[PDB]
Write a protein that binds this ligand. Structure first.
Ligand SMILES: [Fe+3]
Length: 451
């Protein structure tokens, strides 16, 4: 249950075992014959469009990587005689308009033989709202490349596509290992056990948390991910702030996540201020304090060097942490998981595996090269299988149970529902006006727990 060695290696096996059970004709019709999503069908036809490539960094299956650059990455070595790329990256950084998708956590991992790369994409945002790519670097510098080729939108079309496609494969990897398995599922397992371990069932925050938690490499990558898991990464206000995605009107994941955070927060602090009336109570609850330590020190593996608390000194310190717990188990899993059907069905747009190494030049890139690198029918079709299965339930805030008895808690949970209905009708109204709606965080679509 920990994030050790170790435990993480056992996690991946249990995941393969689950996925294996869908390697059969279980929903074959549905699947490979039935109607695919409206968005899936949109992706199929626009996937080569540079804007659709870019757009996904904001509102696709994985909107957790993109960042607004403050300086140009040290890995982005620009060869002599690209004064123009130089000047344009400079222009954008000075304008506060330069963004990046840096896939470095993959650097150095090897991957039935699959090839990995650790690319960097630099994108500009124009007043429009729209993100346009400027340059892809597929491998980082290292000490016999010196100056990795820089692939550009103006290059031989099939080279630009191969470059982009490697970026999507890399996005596929980080998305599933880091942002889905680790950050939602495995962090959920830590929260869950630690609740079971340190808090008796009638402990108020056990009652609060419970409706949300019943119950090679890869290995390399998952270990590194778990290594750099910070507390702020799991908190939208912090996270969207640390990545410069605040004040971005077309950042719909960002908007929705943040608007949910405020709902969860208000619901959280409402319940907390009832039981822990004042900071003194929080500080003095020894069980809660064990529960905190159990998550940060044991479960997350000495995670107190990555923003995580070792104690709760106050209501605010506890509400912030309790809001992170709900969000991780509910909203964020919704955001990370609900998009596989839409974005990963059309396999060329999110290739699960690449079967050749990345190109070192932009020269001699052929359909043979492209088709050779992209997955095969078997890999690609099993991809589609799993993504459909992944993407009856109890929605967020609707645990048809009453662990709390008073009218005071009931009022709190009642406002939560009202605010959730408020966001619901807001999201659905916005989405109606858009060709590319975002709906992985509509409150009704979020399950009251990771399952
Ligand atoms: Fe999941």
């Amino acid at each position: 249950w920990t994030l050790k060695a170790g435990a993480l290696e056992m996690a991946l096996k249990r995941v393969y075992t689950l996925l294996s059970s869908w390697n059969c004709l279980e929903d074959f019709d549905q699947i490979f014959w039935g109607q695919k999503s409206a968005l899936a069908e949109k992706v199929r036809q626009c996937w080569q469009d540079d804007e659709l490539f870019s757009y996904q960094f904001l509102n696709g299956a994985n909107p957790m990587l993109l960042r607004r650059s403050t300086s140009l990455p040290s890995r982005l070595v620009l060869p002599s005689g690209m004064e123009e790329l130089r000047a344009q990256l400079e222009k954008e950084l000075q304008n506060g308009s330069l963004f990046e998708a840096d896939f470095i956590l993959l650097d150095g991992i090897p991957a039935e033989k699959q090839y990995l790369a650790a690319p960097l994409v630099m994108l500009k945002m124009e007043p429009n709202g729209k993100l346009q790519p400027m340059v892809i670097q597929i491998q980082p510098p290292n000490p016999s490349s010196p100056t990795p080729t820089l692939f550009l939108p103006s290059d031989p079309p099939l080279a630009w596509l191969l470059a982009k496609s490697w970026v999507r494969n890399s996005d596929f990897q980080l998305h599933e290992i880091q942002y889905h398995l680790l950050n939602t599922h495995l962090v959920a397992e830590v929260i869950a056990v630690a609740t079971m371990r340190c808090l008796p069932g009638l402990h108020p925050i056990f009652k609060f948390l419970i409706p949300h938690i019943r119950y090679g490499g890869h290995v390399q990558l998952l270990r590194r991910a778990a290594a750099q898991l910070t507390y702020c990464s799991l908190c939208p206000p912090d996270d969207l702030a640390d990545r410069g995605l605040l004040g971005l009107p077309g950042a719909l994941y960002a908007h929705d996540a943040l608007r949910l955070w405020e709902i969860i927060a208000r619901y959280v602090e409402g319940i907390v201020h009832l039981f822990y009336q004042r900071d003194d109570i929080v500080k003095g609850d020894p069980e809660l304090q064990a529960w905190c330590r159990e998550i940060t020190e044991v479960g997350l593996c000495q995670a107190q060097d990555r923003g995580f608390p070792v104690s709760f000194q106050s209501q605010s310190q506890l509400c912030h942490f309790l809001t992170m717990c709900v969000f991780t188990c509910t909203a964020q899993h919704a955001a990370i998981n609900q998009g596989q059907l839409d974005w990963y069905a059309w396999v060329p747009n999110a290739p699960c595996t690449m079967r050749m190494p990345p190109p070192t030049t932009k020269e001699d890139v052929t359909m043979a090269t492209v088709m050779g690198s992209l997955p095969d029918v078997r890999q690609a079709c099993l991809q589609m299988a799993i993504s459909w299965h992944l993407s009856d339930m109890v929605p967020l805030g609707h645990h048809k149970e009453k662990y709390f008895s008073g009218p005071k808690p009931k009022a709190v949970l009642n406002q939560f529902r009202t605010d959730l209905e408020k966001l619901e009708k807001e999201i659905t109204a916005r989405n109606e006006q858009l060709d590319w709606p975002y709906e992985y965080l509509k409150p009704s679509c979020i399950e009251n727990s990771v399952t």
